[PDB]
Amino acid sequence: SELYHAQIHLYKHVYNFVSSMALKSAMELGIADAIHNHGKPMTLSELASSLKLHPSKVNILHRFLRLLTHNGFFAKTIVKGKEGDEEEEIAYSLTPPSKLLISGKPTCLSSIVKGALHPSSLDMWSSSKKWFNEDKEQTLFECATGESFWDFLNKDSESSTLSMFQDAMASDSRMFKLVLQENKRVFEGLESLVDVGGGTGGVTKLIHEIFPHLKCTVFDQPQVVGNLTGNENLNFVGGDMFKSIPSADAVLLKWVLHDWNDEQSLKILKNSKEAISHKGKDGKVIIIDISIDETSDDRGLTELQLDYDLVMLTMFLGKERTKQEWEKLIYDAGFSSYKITPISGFKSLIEVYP
Amino acid sequence: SELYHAQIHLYKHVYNFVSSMALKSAMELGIADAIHNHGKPMTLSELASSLKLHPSKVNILHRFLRLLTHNGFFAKTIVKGKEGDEEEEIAYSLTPPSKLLISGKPTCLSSIVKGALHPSSLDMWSSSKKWFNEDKEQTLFECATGESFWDFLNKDSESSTLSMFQDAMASDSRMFKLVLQENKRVFEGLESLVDVGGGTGGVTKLIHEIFPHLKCTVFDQPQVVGNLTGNENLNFVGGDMFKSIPSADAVLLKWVLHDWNDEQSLKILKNSKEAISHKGKDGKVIIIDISIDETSDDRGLTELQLDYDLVMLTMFLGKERTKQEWEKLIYDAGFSSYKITPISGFKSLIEVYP
Ligand SMILES: Nc1ncnc2c1ncn2[C@@H]1O[C@H](CSCC[C@H](N)C(=O)O)[C@@H](O)[C@H]1O
Ligand SMILES: Nc1ncnc2c1ncn2[C@@H]1O[C@H](CSCC[C@H](N)C(=O)O)[C@@H](O)[C@H]1O
Ligand SMILES: OCc1ccc2c(c1)OC[C@]1(O)c3cc4c(cc3O[C@H]21)OCO4
Ligand SMILES: OCc1ccc2c(c1)OC[C@]1(O)c3cc4c(cc3O[C@H]21)OCO4
């Protein structure tokens, strides 16, 4: 040997980005939609024809397909052959991963894919070195463009970018519904639920689509909840989560602890344990946020989570918590046990028990 | 289930690019060099101090380190603790993969990493959609910048880029020496070798560094070989490989068949089988080029190879061959058997037998 075997590992990571760009191309070309609409395995020719590609772009289409098939986004099949009796020919089929790229469906993740791999998310890396060696505390995006991501989107010049980003957020909120469908046992025995920082009731409306009989109360700041009303199984309450949280069978904390440091998060968790106190060992607190498990055997899941965490760092200077950090908060808060359920690819739903 | 499990696979590929940018940052920061020069596991503090980072950049350094450690470029170790008696503290060590990033060494691949992940290699992907739907046959780089990669580098404005790219090529040629050291058995029983398209003798000089007694003849076009001379175990010969190749125990074809279509490559291989004919079943032809094995069990190696192949496509519109394609040429040429030896991460050295 010589550990000249280390090259293989070095290069896989160097060129890993190519696979992301390939997926990106697949979605922007609408391949999934083309095949799905076709209703059956599609031939290179047929597909090229559907995409209305110029003859010279057909082999490029072939190249991307081969890489994408090897990566599991398509399955090769051999079919009869171009009519005017049969030659052997390859046909492509969608696989579960690519079915996520079919537009018009509730499961479509095309937008999140488009945004995550948009130039406004990628071009900034050319300033990574300057970013490390400067004295200004800022995001990689600010260091590279001279303005925060938020400001960039709001520029008249970036009308569409702000629109696309906006689509990804809607698509991301919508997915949470699937999260509910896939984990009913989490809300089944509950009579009531308090949605902390539930804004104007968007999330609770989704909960109400799957659990119509659940009495939910949207809790937020006085000025955000205004004086909204109704829906006997839906009520709004204004207040400060750091003072107290309305009592209920369970407390929902969806994307809240992400924005607060430990000291503030601990106080919120403590108030959450109080809101369910009356229900005793029956109550629970539900935390929906990312949980990175470094000791997990699924190394690839952890890499993906850490990758997302790095995007949060370079774009917003934000952070995600590890399983240990989460454990400290939970037990420090006074809870007895907890369970983590993976959701939406790499996110987590955490059931916390007093 | 629901095949909502497909999300995990979809996202891993979406965010795969993050791992490439992280490696990129590691090399530009010179982390490997910092630790290597230190001579022993290095602490976050010590490392931050070595890189002379501003206090606010230390936690970013931490973040990148965690991801890179999980990806195998560093190994965590717990050491005594900051003097003025011990607290427990983490220390980072290089691993084989990162030792490839130590500058000044013959094994350094930093340059190839820097070039492969340079803005001039990445920014062009924002034109991937326009590229697929246009009627002009060109590379993704031409479609995005309005000029070929070659022209771009030669612009006075891109002095340094052309310099960096130039460094990666030298570094890549140099690696071939390691290839020779790691595969002596390939050239051991040879008395003579003909280096087809050996230019002015650069490659043969490397061969002469490991096998000083091997009689090598650099074969190329009359105008390139001019009238070079000497070195009793080194001679130059001008000619046309499509007409004939000087006879020798073995024919070396390093990065030649890559530039020719099958028809031209087959003719070259046939002339190669003739140049070794006199040596009988003892002779051999040595092909150094990429070989993509789709049926290989090492799926990751094939992905890397296909990834590189996609870079060759979008940058130069070039292509690499699969193992089957190579097999067709070899047997079509009239050879009996062949063997493939992986080299330099994802390249191949192919021994062909008459
Ligand atoms: N002291 C406080 N008490 C209750 N809500 C608060 C608060 N301070 C901020 N908020 C609310 O915190 C929310 C954070 S956004 C919460 C996300 C939401 N549950 C979702 O699923 O998308 C905002 O709606 C904000 O108005
Ligand atoms: N008909 C022909 N016969 C021999 N050499 C030829 C040729 N046409 C082109 N070449 C030579 O082809 C070479 C291609 S580059 C070959 C790469 C080289 N062996 C390496 O290891 O880097 C050039 O040096 C070119 O001069
Ligand atoms: O947790 C909320 C949340 C959910 C998804 C995403 C978030 C944040 O930001 C990062 C991201 O990768 C991203 C970056 C973008 C973009 C969309 C986009 O979606 C991805 O448009 C322009 O830049
Ligand atoms: O087989 C020869 C060979 C060897 C390595 C490389 C080649 C070709 O081009 C692609 C590549 O990824 C690349 C692209 C670049 C660059 C360097 C660079 O090195 C990489 O500088 C600017 O753009």
Q: Which residues pair with A288 in a beta bridge?
A: A254, A349
HSE toward the beta carbon, residue A247, CA cutoff 13 A: 6
Compute the distance between CA of residue B201 and CA of residue B216 in angstroms, rounded to an integer.
10
DSSP letter for each residue of B279-301: GGGG-EEEEEE-EE-TT-S-HHH
What is the number of the ligand closest to the CA of B345?
A: 4
When CB atoms are compared, the residue of B57, B99, B113 closest to A14 is B113
Exposed/middle/buried for residue A351 (C-beta within 10 Å: 0-12, 13-18, 19+): middle
- Tell me the ligand closest to B164's alpha carbon: 4
- Residues 166-185 of chain A whose Cβ lies under 8 A from any Cβ of chain B: 178, 181-182
Interface residue of A1, A7, A175, A316 to substitute, partner B, most B CBs within 10 Å: A7
As a whole number of angstroms, the distance between CA B331 and CA B335 comes to 5
In this structure, what are the phi and psi dihedrals at residue B212, rounded to the nearest 5 degrees?
A: -50, -30
Neighbours of B292 (CB within 10 A): 24
Q: What is the DSSP secondary-structure string of B325-348?
A: HHHHHHHHHT--EEEEEEETTTEE
Which element (helix H / strand E) includes B98? helix B96-99
Give the whole-angstrom CA distance, residue B341 versus residue A242. 65
Contacts of A182 in chain B (CB under 8 A): 2, 4
In Å, how far is A171's CA from the nearest CA of chain B? 13
Contact B305, B347 (CB under 8 A): no
Residue of A nearest to B29 (CA): A129
Selected residues 307-336 of chain B with any CB under 8 Å from a CB in chain A: 307-311, 313
| Angle in degrees, CA A36, A53, A112, rounded to 5 | 50
How many A from CA of B92 to the centre of ligand 1? 39
User: Would you call A13 and B19 a contact, using CB atoms and an 8 Å cutoff?
Assistant: yes
What φ, ψ does residue A176 adopt, rounded to 5°? -55, -25
Q: Which of A194, A241, A244, A285 for a ligand 1 pocket mutation test, highest count of atoms within 8 Å of Cβ? A: A241
List all residues of chain B from 192 to 231 with a beta carbon under 8 Å from chain A: none
Q: Cα angle vertex B80, ends B66, A293, to 5°?
A: 25
Structure-solving method: X-ray
Q: Quick one: which ligand is closest to B246's CA?
A: 2
CB contact burial A71-101 (16+ within 10 A = b; e otherwise): bbbbeeeeeeeeeeeeeeebbbebbbbbbbb
**Resolution of the structure in the document, Å:** 2.5
Domains, chain B, in order of start with CATH, read 1-101 (1.10.10.10), 102-354 (3.40.50.150)
Hey, what amino acid is at A82?
A: K
Q: From the candidates A1, A3, A20, which should be mutated to test the interface with B, based on the most B CB atoms within 10 A? A: A20
Question: Cα–Cα distances in Å, from A335 out to A248, A257, A273, B121, B256?
Answer: 17, 16, 8, 51, 68
Instruction: Check pocket membership of B120 for ligand 4, CB cut-off 6 A.
Output: yes
Task: Find the Cα–Cα–Cα–Cα dihedral B99, B101, B102, B108, rounded to 10°.
Answer: 100
Q: What angle do CA A138, A139, A144 make, to 5 degrees?
A: 100
For residue B43, the SS3 value is strand
Residue A338 main-chain phi, psi, to 5 deg: -165, 165
A83 touches chain B (CB under 8 A): no
Report the alpha-carbon distance of residue A76 to residue A70 in Å, rounded: 9
Residues of B with Cβ-Cβ distance to A324 under 8 angstroms: none
Q: Which residue of A has its CA nearest to B24?
A: A14
Do the bridges between strand B74-79 and strand B284-289 make them parallel or antiparallel, or are there none, so unpaired? Answer: unpaired
**Read out DSSP for A137-202?**
---HHHHHHSS-HHHHHHSGGGHHHHHHHHHHHHHHHHHHHHHHHHTGGGTTT-SEEEEET-TTSH
| DSSP secondary structure code for residue B46 in this structure | H
**Binding-site residues, ligand 2, Cβ < 6 A:** B 197-199, 203, 220-221, 224, 240-242, 254-256
Out of B15, B123, B307, closest to residue A308 by CB: B15
Q: Are strands B215-220 and B234-238 parallel, antiparallel or unpaired?
A: parallel
B13 is catalytic: no
Chain B residue with Cα closest to A111: B14
